[PDB]
């Protein structure tokens, strides 16, 4: 009976909440109250990367912390040298509606996708020297919201068809499908060991997936509206989510519950993008009100603000070496901050 | 040395700027359009007629008086639109196609009105004009002339509604057909005249799926949209 199954899930639901409540000794704020505040974090715009015609949804830093790729609705992928502000590549896209971009860790490939429901793979290191499409990964029935390379042959994609997919780029096939979300999957984040990844969806929940087993280990609730952004904490044992409910939250994997909420009464707009600093002490979040807020990840205090962009801050990225932050925006500009 | 590298990098950067400047001229010379409609709106027939005169998303390109129009039709997306609708915040207009004969899914027209309300009052679409196609006009006339419609059953305000004085009936149109037409338009204009605030505009049109005037109707609304934008920038 459907009602019997519906009740059984509800009963187990209560047990998981009781199990989570049993492990709640003290709040992270109680543990952290003796820590010194980080103080006022004052960051300035060191660079403004100009050249995109339309708004930017996505940027991704290279593992060299110097090159970075950005995607604009004008149908362009632009690879920047952030040190010199010189453009290295300008890749025209077949579909102008691009929603995500990824840079491979090796630096040999970039990926992008959007409303065409395709992850396009680009070879940056062709013999002829011209960037060509390596693969088109088809099989998602909804738009791609996020993609992240594992290596030159594997990439993980999240889609508006409520699924995540792991692709073998050479064959162009889905080796694994990750199902269990009921809303659009908006963002994904690989663990530092790339054995697991987390996704945040429009069902206001975040799920932890095992890549090789292709199954959901854990589901995280606490947000009220759609989750737009997600990022692992540097040690890989926690992650942070930004939502349309105008809050950021930190979830601990092993505690299996929400750990802290980042919000203020003056903030009534959703978060579009989140990222940790190199040590994870700072949580940076892009907002709909054109600003980025720097949070003390341990104390839930706004340490600072990035206030340069004239339109929606859509995307965020902190370099691997922790030197700089990039903000992409709907005003078609990339800014670099220290 | 390094100077050979950095001069090479500036040499590559200027080829991109040369190409990006060319791309900018084409981008500003094209008007992008989002075609939104329910499946039973007649929107697919509309795309087909324009194709003979001249997938997660379908694109068609038509040219009216040497002006480029790029129309995008959603395919293979879920009915959840609250995320991917934000991609079209900067199109010239959203072409919203409505089946006007669909009041008798119990009430498709009430669903079309709710969708228009969400589009009109979304924060990211505040500056986006909407061209409203009231499509099944031929079917609306045939239904209301038979006496089986009973619009009052789905819209009780239709009992007390009177045809506005500015109404321009088509030749040979029954006053009942004319009255039913303008009531549904006034359903959409009640939403549009609230919160429009002189930033985005609604251009309703009584269409049919096989009208050859539709591309001209879109062209004339786009030029009106562009002119109003320019006059706003000059504070006129």
């Amino acid at each position: 009976e459907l009602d019997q199954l519906r009740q059984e899930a509800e009963q187990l639901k209560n047990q998981i909440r009781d199990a989570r409540k049993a492990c709640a000794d003290a709040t992270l704020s109680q543990i952290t109250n003796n820590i010194d505040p980080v103080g006022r974090i004052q960051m300035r715009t060191r660079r403004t990367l100009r050249g995109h015609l339309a708004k930017i949804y996505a940027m991704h830093w290279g593992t060299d912390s110097r090159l970075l790729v950005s995607a604009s609705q004008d149908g362009k992928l632009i690879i920047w040298d952030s040190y010199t502000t010189n453009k290295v590549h300008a890749i025209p896209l077949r579909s102008s509606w691009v929603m995500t971009c990824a840079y491979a860790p090796s630096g040999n490939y970039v990926a992008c996708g959007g409303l065409d429901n395709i992850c396009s793979i680009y070879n940056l290191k062709t013999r002829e020297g011209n960037v060509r499409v390596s693969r088109e990964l088809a099989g998602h029935t909804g738009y791609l919201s996020c993609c992240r390379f594992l290596d030159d042959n594997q990439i993980v994609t999240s889609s508006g068809d409520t699924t995540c997919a792991l692709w073998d780029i050479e064959t162009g096939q889905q080796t694994t499908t990750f199902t269990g979300h009921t809303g659009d999957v908006m963002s994904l984040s690989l663990a530092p060991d790339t054995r697991l990844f987390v996704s945040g969806a429009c069902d206001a929940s975040a799920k932890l997936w095992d890549v090789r087993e292709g199954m959901c280990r854990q589901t995280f609730t606490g947000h009220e509206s759609d989750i737009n952004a997600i990022c692992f904490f540097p040690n890989g044992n926690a992650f942070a989510t930004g939502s349309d409910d105008a809050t950021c939250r930190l979830f601990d994997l092993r505690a299996d519950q929400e750990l802290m909420t980042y919000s203020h009464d003056n903030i009534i707009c959703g978060i579009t993008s989140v990222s940790f600093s190199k040590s994870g002490r700072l949580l940076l979040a892009g907002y709909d009100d054109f600003n980025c807020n720097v949070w003390d990840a341990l104390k839930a205090d706004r340490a600072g603000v990035l206030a340069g962009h004239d339109n929606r801050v859509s995307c965020l990225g902190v370099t691997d070496d922790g030197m700089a932050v990039a903000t992409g925006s709907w005003d078609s500009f990339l800014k670099i901050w220290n | 040395d390094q100077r050979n590298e950095e001069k090479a990098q500036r040499e590559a950067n200027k080829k991109i700027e040369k190409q990006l400047q060319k791309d900018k001229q084409v981008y500003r010379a094209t008007h992008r359009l989002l075609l939104l409609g329910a499946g039973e709106s007649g929107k697919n027939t509309i795309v087909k007629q324009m194709r003979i005169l001249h997938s997660g998303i379908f694109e068609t390109k038509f040219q009216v008086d040497k002006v480029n129009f790029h129309m995008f039709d959603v395919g293979a997306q879920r009915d959840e639109r609250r995320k991917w609708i934000q991609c079209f915040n900067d199109v010239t207009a959203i072409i919203f196609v409505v089946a006007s004969s669909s009041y008798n899914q119990t009430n498709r027209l009430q669903a079309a009105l709710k969708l228009f309300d969400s589009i009109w009052n979304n924060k990211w679409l505040r500056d986006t004009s909407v061209i409203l196609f009231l499509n099944k006009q031929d079917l609306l006339a045939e239904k209301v002339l038979a006496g089986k419609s009973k619009i009052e059953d789905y819209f009780p305000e239709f009992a007390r509604y009177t045809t506005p004085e500015d109404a321009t009936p088509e030749p040979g149109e029954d006053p009942r057909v004319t009255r039913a037409k303008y009531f549904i338009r006034d359903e959409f204009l009640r939403i549009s005249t609230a919160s429009g605030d002189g930033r985005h505009y609604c251009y309703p049109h009584f269409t049919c799926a096989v009208d050859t005037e539709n591309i001209r109707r879109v062209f004339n609304d786009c030029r009106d949209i562009i002119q109003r934008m320019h006059l706003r920038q000059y504070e006129l």
């Epitope: 009220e224 349309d244 409910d245 | 609250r82 009052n121």
Partner: nanobody, 126 residues
Framework: QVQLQESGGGLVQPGGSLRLSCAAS????????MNWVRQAPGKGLEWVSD????????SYTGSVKGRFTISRDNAKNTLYLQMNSLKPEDTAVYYC?????????????????????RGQGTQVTV
């Protein structure tokens, strides 16, 4: 966790009233615009009524005008639908749906087939 629980449905003869209650939890109830939607047998989901954050602005589908009344109590986090003089075509499963984002005039997708912020409806047969 966002949860909506509907109650008060039943079997009623035509012309008899029912009062539906929606118990809400897992979000700030006062920040959201609430909705009532139905699904008749063999048909799609249909929007019935909505109420704004404070309860001031109210809308109905034409078929229930002057017949159904929507009410909210922010203090108790409850949504109400008092249905009077029911008709046989009011027979449906009634869902309490919440608008997806807070502080928004627009309300997208509440009638979608797999909308998340919707309860498991209560059956009403007339």
């Amino acid at each position: 966790q966002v949860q909506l629980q509907e109650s008060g449905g039943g079997l009623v003869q035509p012309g008899g009233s029912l009062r539906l209650s929606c118990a809400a939890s897992g979000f700030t109830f006062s920040n959201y615009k609430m909705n009532w939607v139905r699904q008749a047998p063999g048909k799609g989901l249909e929007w019935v009524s909505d109420i704004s954050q404070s309860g001031a602005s109210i809308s109905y589908t034409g078929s229930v005008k002057g017949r159904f009344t929507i009410s909210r109590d922010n203090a108790k986090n409850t949504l109400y639908l008092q249905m009077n003089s029911l008709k046989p075509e009011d027979t449906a499963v009634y869902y309490c749906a919440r608008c997806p984002a807070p502080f928004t005039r627009d309300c997208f997708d509440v009638t979608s087939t797999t909308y998340a912020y919707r309860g498991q409806g209560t059956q009403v047969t007339v």
